[PDB]
Amino acid sequence: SHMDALRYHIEWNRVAEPGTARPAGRLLAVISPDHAGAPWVTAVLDALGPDTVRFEAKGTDRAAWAAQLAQLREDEGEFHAVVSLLAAAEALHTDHGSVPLGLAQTLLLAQALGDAGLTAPLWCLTRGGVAAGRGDVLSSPVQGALWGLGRVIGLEHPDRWGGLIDLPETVDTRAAARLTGLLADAGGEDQLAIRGSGVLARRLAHAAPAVPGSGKRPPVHGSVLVTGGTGGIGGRVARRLAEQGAAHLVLTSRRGADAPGAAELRAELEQLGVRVTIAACDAADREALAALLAELPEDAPLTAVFHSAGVAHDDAPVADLTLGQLDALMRAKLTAARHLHELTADLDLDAFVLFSSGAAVWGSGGQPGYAAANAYLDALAEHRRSLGLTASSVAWGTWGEVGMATDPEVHDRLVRQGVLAMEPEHALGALDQMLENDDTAAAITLMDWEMFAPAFTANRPSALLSTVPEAVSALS
């Protein structure tokens, strides 16, 4: 129950139908002009009406947009809300190959709105960026990344953040009226999915307790690939896999066998009877991943991937983050997980496990780029399930003992927010509960809700935490 207590999941609950009147003040719609053709972008522009002012966000030029926005705000006076359709730009930015153009443009729009003093709440619309409601299909993991950024905008700029709304693929008049009614007043909700059945909103809940055996997890066997396998959590994952039956562990990281601690890790694993391969290669390098897969023993086919590669450093507040910082944070997450997905789809793996973060699940100030990068992982795991493929996303809280949060700097701030350091064995024992259940998505975190809830909600309420009774109690 100690391990059950670490597991949470995202659910979607029905909320009230909104009012029937459109907003009284003027809306400002923001369009990516090369990527304004999708049906849902037309349906949304039509629902906003012809009195809505339209801003075409061209390229990625913060100072140019700040100037253009300042002119609009001068001419129009205050807007009621800003409605961004930038998410429809899913093509990669030409200069930053791991950043979807719409993600870069949404960052620069949040930045330029603050620069210009346009204060109306920003709403970021997606289509297929969340899996909400029974049978729902997350069709665009790229747009799913924009939710990780948006939750961090709502932490950093709470007064000028509206929220996120996912649209259905057909935006009929019932969907349009939910939309415009939420923009009038959203009832204090800010992470919303419009579906045929109603409006759903995002919630964090404790996961159901483990059912010993219920997931038909197959025995660990053959070759298992742990990207980031020489790093802190990846090394501990590899040890556990060795103890459990893996014939062969393939560990990767940019430094490979030159990684800190690598020789000792190899010796620890080989003592347990496992074949060990340690390779040096960037998880975003598709050709190197293909070569690595082509090399596998005939008698030890790839049976599972654990994607632990990642960096969190050189992030910045939303107001300051650059596209080159965002690219570097996205590389081992979006680019590398897309390669892993595409080169293993046909292999019938037993597990495809992606390591996300609480930064992506609930949001962490100061970590927009890392939140977006991890949110892509969570969305890709739901998207793969829709294709009939296994996938799981595990959004860790804080690890103790090994890995990126052992820096007293990085450790001190997390623990002080109530995201407490987990013992490796407990974190791994909870991941094994998730994998035995074959759950698609979970956060695995030790929380002190009496510290977390009041800090997280100091400037704006969080409907997300209303389904965690300890958070409700802390706020009473």
Ligand X SMILES: NC(=O)C1=CN([C@@H]2O[C@H](COP(=O)(O)OP(=O)(O)OC[C@H]3O[C@@H](n4cnc5c(N)ncnc54)[C@H](OP(=O)(O)O)[C@@H]3O)[C@@H](O)[C@H]2O)C=CC1
Told to check if 111 binds ligand X by CB under 6 A, we report no
216 annotated ligand-binding residue: no
Task: Name the nearest CA neighbour of 398 among 456, 445, 434.
Answer: 445
Out of 255, 275, 338, 413, the residue judged to bind ligand X by CB under 6 A: 255
213 annotated ligand-binding residue: no
**Per CB under 6 A, which of residues 132..171 are in contact with ligand X?**
none
- Piece of 16-24, 177-185, 361-369, 391-399 that binds ligand X (CB under 6 A): 391-399
Out of 8, 362, 396, 452, the residue judged to bind ligand X by CB under 6 A: 396
333 annotated ligand-binding residue: yes
Closest approach of ligand X to the CB of residue 90, in Å: 22
Q: CA–CA separation, 324 vs 318, rounded Å?
A: 13
Q: CA–CA separation, 387 vs 381, rounded Å?
A: 10
235 annotated ligand-binding residue: no
The CB density around residue 118, as the number of other CB atoms within 10 Å, is 21
Task: Write the interaction track for ligand X spanning residues 39-58; mark x where CB under 6 A is met and - where it is not.
Answer: --------------------
Out of 223, 277, 308, 344, the residue judged to bind ligand X by CB under 6 A: 308
Q: CA–CA separation, 26 vs 64, rounded Å?
A: 23
Taking a C-beta distance cutoff of 8 angstroms, is the pair 217, 436 a contact? yes
Burial of 148 (0-12, 13-18, 19+ CB in 10 A): buried
254 annotated ligand-binding residue: yes
The CB density around residue 451, as the number of other CB atoms within 10 Å, is 16
**Per CB under 6 A, which of residues 353..372 are in contact with ligand X?**
355, 357
Instruction: For tokens 């029905």, name the residue.
Output: 14
Told to check if 254 binds ligand X by CB under 6 A, we report yes
310 annotated ligand-binding residue: yes
For 343-365, b where at least 16 C-beta lie within 10 A, e where not — what string? bbeeeebbbbbbbbbbbbbbbbb
114 annotated ligand-binding residue: no
DSSP letter string, 187-235: TT--EEEEETTEEEEEEEEEPPPP-TTTT-PPPP-SEEEEETTTSHHHH
Out of 148, 231, 368, 418, the residue judged to bind ligand X by CB under 6 A: 231
Residues in the interface with ligand X (CB under 6 A) total: 30
Q: CA–CA separation, 312 vs 410, rounded Å?
A: 10
Q: CA–CA separation, 361 vs 8, rounded Å?
A: 10
The strand pair at 191-195 and 198-206 is best described as antiparallel
Out of 79, 399, 449, 452, the residue judged to bind ligand X by CB under 6 A: 399
Out of 405, 434, 443, 474, the residue judged to bind ligand X by CB under 6 A: 405
First to last CA, the chain: 26
Out of 202, 331, 339, 384, the residue judged to bind ligand X by CB under 6 A: 331
Out of 310, 363, 366, 369, the residue judged to bind ligand X by CB under 6 A: 310
8 annotated ligand-binding residue: no
- Piece of 47-55, 268-276, 282-290, 467-475 that binds ligand X (CB under 6 A): 282-290
- Pick between residue 203 and residue 331 the one whose CB is nearest to ligand X: 331
- Residues in binding site for NADP(+): 232-233, 254-255, 282-283, 308-310, 333, 370, 399, 404
- Residues in the site for ligand X, rule: CB under 6 A? 227-228, 230-234, 252-255, 259, 282-284, 308-312, 331-332, 355, 357, 396, 398-399, 403-405
